[PDB]
Amino acid sequence: HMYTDLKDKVVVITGGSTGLGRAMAVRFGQEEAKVVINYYNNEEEALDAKKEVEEAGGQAIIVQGDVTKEEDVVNLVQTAIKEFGTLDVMINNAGVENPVPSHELSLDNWNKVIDTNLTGAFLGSREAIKYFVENDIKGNVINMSSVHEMIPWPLFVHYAASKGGMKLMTETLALEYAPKGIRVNNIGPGAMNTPINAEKFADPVQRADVESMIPMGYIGKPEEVAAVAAFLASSQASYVTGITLFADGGMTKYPSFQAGRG
Amino acid sequence: HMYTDLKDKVVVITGGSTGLGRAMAVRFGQEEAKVVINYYNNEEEALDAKKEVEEAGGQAIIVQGDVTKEEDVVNLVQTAIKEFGTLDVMINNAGVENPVPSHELSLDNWNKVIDTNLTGAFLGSREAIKYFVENDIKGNVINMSSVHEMIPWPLFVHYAASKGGMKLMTETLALEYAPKGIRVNNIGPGAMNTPINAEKFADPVQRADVESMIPMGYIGKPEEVAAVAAFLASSQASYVTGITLFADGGMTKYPSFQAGRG
Amino acid sequence: HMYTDLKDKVVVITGGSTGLGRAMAVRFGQEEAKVVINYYNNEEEALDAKKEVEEAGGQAIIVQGDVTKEEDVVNLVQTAIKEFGTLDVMINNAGVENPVPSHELSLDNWNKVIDTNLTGAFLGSREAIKYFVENDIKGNVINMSSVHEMIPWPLFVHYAASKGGMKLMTETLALEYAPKGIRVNNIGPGAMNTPINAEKFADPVQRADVESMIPMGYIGKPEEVAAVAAFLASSQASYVTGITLFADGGMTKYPSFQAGRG
Amino acid sequence: HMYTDLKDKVVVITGGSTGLGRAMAVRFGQEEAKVVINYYNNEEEALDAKKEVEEAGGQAIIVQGDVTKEEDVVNLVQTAIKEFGTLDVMINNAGVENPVPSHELSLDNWNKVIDTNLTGAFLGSREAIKYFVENDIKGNVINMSSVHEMIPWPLFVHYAASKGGMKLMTETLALEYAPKGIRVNNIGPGAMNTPINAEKFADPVQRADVESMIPMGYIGKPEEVAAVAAFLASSQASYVTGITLFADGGMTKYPSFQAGRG
Numbered sequence A, B, C, D: 001h002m003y004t005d006l007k008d009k010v011v012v013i014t015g016g017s018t019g020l021g022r023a024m025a026v027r028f029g030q031e032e033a034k035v036v037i038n039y040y041n042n043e044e045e046a047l048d049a050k051k052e053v054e055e056a057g058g059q060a061i062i063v064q065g066d067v068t069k070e071e072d073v074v075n076l077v078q079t080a081i082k083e084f085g086t087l088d089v090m091i092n093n094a095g096v097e098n099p100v101p102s103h104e105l106s107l108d109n110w111n112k113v114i115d116t117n118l119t120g121a122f123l124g125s126r127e128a129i130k131y132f133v134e135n136d137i138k139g140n141v142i143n144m145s146s147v148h149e150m151i152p153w154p155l156f157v158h159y160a161a162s163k164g165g166m167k168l169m170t171e172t173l174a175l176e177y178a179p180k181g182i183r184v185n186n187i188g189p190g191a192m193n194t195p196i197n198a199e200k201f202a203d204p205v206q207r208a209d210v211e212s213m214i215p216m217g218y219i220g221k222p223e224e225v226a227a228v229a230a231f232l233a234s235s236q237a238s239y240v241t242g243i244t245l246f247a248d249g250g251m252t253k254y255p256s257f258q259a260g261r262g
C-alpha cells in the first residue's frame, strides 16, 4: 500500500461513521492503520464503517461520543489508548450546519454550531496534544475545516465563524507545538458527495448550481479528501505544519470570475 | 470637525469605558455623535468616560451589561433606541485574554474567551443588523478584532480562535447584508497602550520585547485605532465593507524578517 | 476641509489625468495639497485635470512620462522636488490590462502589463523612498492595486500576477522602511466607473453582469477610492502600514456565494 | 513505490540539476517517471542528476536553457515531447535572489529576478498548458514559490514581488484551466538545505539564527519538498488545484510569536 509509515498507527476520527469521516476511516484502513471510529447516535453505520476498515486491511473499534461533551472527548482518546496502546493521529471531523438568515439566527443555534464545529475540535486537539506531549510522541493532528474558513457563507454565519476560528486554532497549535515535532493541519473540503449534501444534490437544478461553483466541474468524491488526510498524516508531510490544504476543485479561487468576467 | 456626516449619529460601544473602547467613545464625541457606552464591571470608569465624551462635544449615556448574556445585548440596543431615537453604528469592542499553554487550557477558560470575544460580537452584530433590516437603515457595524485574526498566538489559542472566527463572521455578514447598504468591517489592532496590556508593559524587559516586534517601533496609541473607527463608520468608507483594517505599526508583516533574516 | 494635515503636502500621481488617478488628483486638491500629475499620452486630458485640481483649492503641475522608463520616473520625482520643494506622498496609479486566454498570451503582452503595473510602481516607490531616506522625511507611498491581488482573473493572468506582485512589494517596503516612519500601503479597487471599463460597461448586458458580482450592487464611483487615498496619506492612518485596503463593495467576499448557494 | 500513477509520466523540471530541482528529479525517478532536467550552465551537475534518476529507477534526459529566454523555454517543452512522447507534469523551479536595500535596488537587478522567478514560470506554465489543451491531456503544473509569497522580505523586494505575482499567476491558471482537468499549484518552501543556502548555513551563528525562525527547529531537507511535489503531481491530489502548499516547518505562522510573546 501507499504510505507504509502509516502501518499500525492509531488514528482517532470524530464523526467517522459517515461521509468524509467514513471515507477517511476506510483509507487509513487501506494503509493498515488501527482506526478508532467516533459516532454520535447511529451505531449501525459505525459498525458498517468498522467492517470496511477491517476488510480494507485495517484494525478498528467504535466509540460513542458527543463532541460537545468534554467527558466524551476525554473518554474517546482514553479508549483509543486503552485499546490500541497509543495514539498517533487525531482527526476532528464532526460538524453540523443549517441555513438561517443571520439577523434571525438564535443564540442556541449559533452555540450548537460553535460548540460542535470549533469547540469540539479544540477539545479533540487538546486531548491528543496532551498525550503526545506527556509521552514524547511526534503525533499528528488533522482538523476538518472547509472552504468556508476562507469563503464567507450567508445564512451560515455560525458555520463560517466556526471554521474561521478553527483556522487560527490550528495555526496556533502548530506554532505552539512545532518544537515538539507535533504537526497540526487543516483540510479544506469544497462541495463533497456526502450524506449531508445528498439531499441538496437530489434536485438536478441544485446539483447543477453547486457544480457551477466548482471550477473542475464535479462534486468531490470523499476518497479525494481521504487522500489528503493520508498524505498529511504521513511522514511524507514531515515539513508541513500549520497549513490549510484546500481540496475544493478550485472553489476558493472565486468561481464567479471564470471566463474573464468582472 | 473631520467627518461631519457623523454628527448626531447613534454609536453603541461595548467595553467603551476603558482602552480602545474609551478612545473610540471620545473620538465619536469629537465628531459630535451620540455615544452609548456599555460597561460590565466598573461604573466609576464609565462615568469618567461619559464625561470625556461630553467635553469633546458629544452626547453620552452609560449602560451596564455583560456581552455574554443575550438579554444584556438586546437591552443595550433597545436602550440606545429609547434614549437616542435610533441606531447608526454598532461597535463590538469587549474582549478578554489570558495566557495558558494550550494543552492545559480548560474548557471553561476557552468558553469564557469565545463567549466574550466572538459570541458577544455576533449578538451585538445580530441585534444591530435586525434593527437595520426592519427599519430600512443603512447602518454600520465595526467589530474589534486583532492582528491575531491573522497572527497565530501560542498561549492564547482561545483568543486567536475567537478573532479568526470574528473575521469570517464579519465577512459573511458584510456579504449577506451588502445589498441592503449595511456595511460590516473589522479593525485589527496590534500592541496598543491599553489596560489589557498594563501589566505586560510595566515590566521594562517585556515592553522592550513587544516593541522589538513592532516594525514602526512604538506601542500604538489608542487614538490611532479610534481614527480608523471614525473613518470606517463615515460615509468616506461608503464602498468599504467586509474588510479587516490592521492598525498595527506593521506587526502582521512578520517582525522576525526585518533586515532580511531568514 | 477634512484632513488639514494634508494642506501643502506634495502628492505625485502617476496616470493622474483620467479615472482613479484624476479622482485622487481632485481629492488632494480639495485638501489643498500640491498635486503633481503624471500623464503618458494625452496632454489635453491632463490639462483638464490640472484645472479641476486648481478649482478644488489645490496647486498642480503636469509632467509627461512613461512609467516603464526609469528616466521618466526619476525625472518625475526630481520635477516634483524642483517645482514644489519636496515630496510627501507618492501614488503609483498607472495600470493597463487586456483579455487574452493565458495559453495564448504573448511574452511582449505579458511584459507590457508587468512592466507598467508592477515595475513602474517599484520604480515610483524606490525613487520616493530614496528621497525620504536621504532627507529624513516620514513620507508616504500609496500603490494602486486591485481586488485582483486576491481575486484570480482568467484572461488576465498578467494583470493578476502584477497586482499579486504589487502586494508583496508593498508589504516588503512597509516592513523594510517602517522603523523610519515611512508608510507604504495598497488600495484595492473593485469595478469602478473609469475609462479602463468604459467599453465593458457600455454593453448593457456586461454592465448588468459586472453589477451582479458586486454585493453592494453598484459600480464604484472614482471618488469613493480617492476618499481611501486621502485617509491613508493622512496622519489619521499613522499606525497603518503594509495593508491592502479594499474598496470593492464586497467583491473580495465571493459574489457567487450570496444567498447561501454552495 | 509510492505513487504508481506516476510511472512513466513525463516530468519537466527547470533548474533541475541542483537543490530542490535535483531532489525533485530524483524523487520522480523513484516513482519510475521520465524526467527532463533543465539547466542553465553547469552541465556536469545535470549529468550527475541524470544518473541518480536512472539509478533511482527512472528514465531521464538533460536540456540546456535559460528561462529568461522564450526560445529556450519553448525548446525545453518541445524536446520533452520529442524525446518521451508527451508531457504530463511541468515544474517551474528556477530562481535567483540577492540582498540589496530596496531604495538602492537597480532596475536591471529587479528585472533579472522578475524575469527569472516570475516570467520564466509564466513561460513554462504557458507552454505546458498549451500542450495539454491542444492534446486534451489532464496535465499538471507545479510552480516553485516560497514562504515569501506570503512573508515579506526586506532586502529582497524583487524576490518577494516575483513570488507574490507567482501566487496570483498560479491561482489564475488553476481557475482558467480547471474545466479542462488541468491542475495548477504552488509549493512554498521555507529555509531548505540547498546549494544557495549552503553558504549562509556555514556560519554557525547564521545557521542558528535561521533555525530560530523555523518553529519545527530544523532546516528542511530537499526530499521533504520533493515529497510534496510527488503528492501534488499524483492523482492523489485529483481535487487539489490553485493552492499553495507551504512546506516550511511553520515559518509562515509568525515565528516571533512563539511562547506567547507580543
Ligand SMILES: OC[C@H]1O[C@@H](O)[C@H](O)[C@@H](O)[C@@H]1O
Binding pocket: B097, B145, B146, B147, B148, B189, B190, B191, B192, B196, B197, D261, D262
Ligand atoms: O500581540 C499584539 C496584541 O494583540 C492584541 O489583540 C492583544 O489584545 C494584545 O494583548 C497584544 O499585545
Ligand SMILES: OC[C@H]1O[C@@H](O)[C@H](O)[C@@H](O)[C@@H]1O
Binding pocket: B261, B262, D097, D145, D146, D147, D148, D189, D190, D191, D192, D196, D197
Ligand atoms: O526565508 C526562507 C527561505 O525562503 C526561500 O524563498 C529562499 O530561497 C531561502 O534562501 C530562504 O532561506
Ligand SMILES: OC[C@H]1O[C@@H](O)[C@H](O)[C@@H](O)[C@@H]1O
Binding pocket: A261, A262, C097, C145, C146, C147, C148, C189, C190, C191, C192, C196, C197
Ligand atoms: O474585476 C474588478 C475590476 O478590477 C479592476 O482592477 C480592473 O481594472 C477592472 O477592469 C475590473 O472590473
Ligand SMILES: OC[C@H]1O[C@@H](O)[C@H](O)[C@@H](O)[C@@H]1O
Binding pocket: A097, A145, A146, A147, A148, A189, A190, A191, A192, A196, A197, C261, C262
Ligand atoms: O459550500 C461548499 C461546501 O462547504 C462545506 O463546508 C459544507 O459542509 C458543504 O455543505 C458545502 O457544499
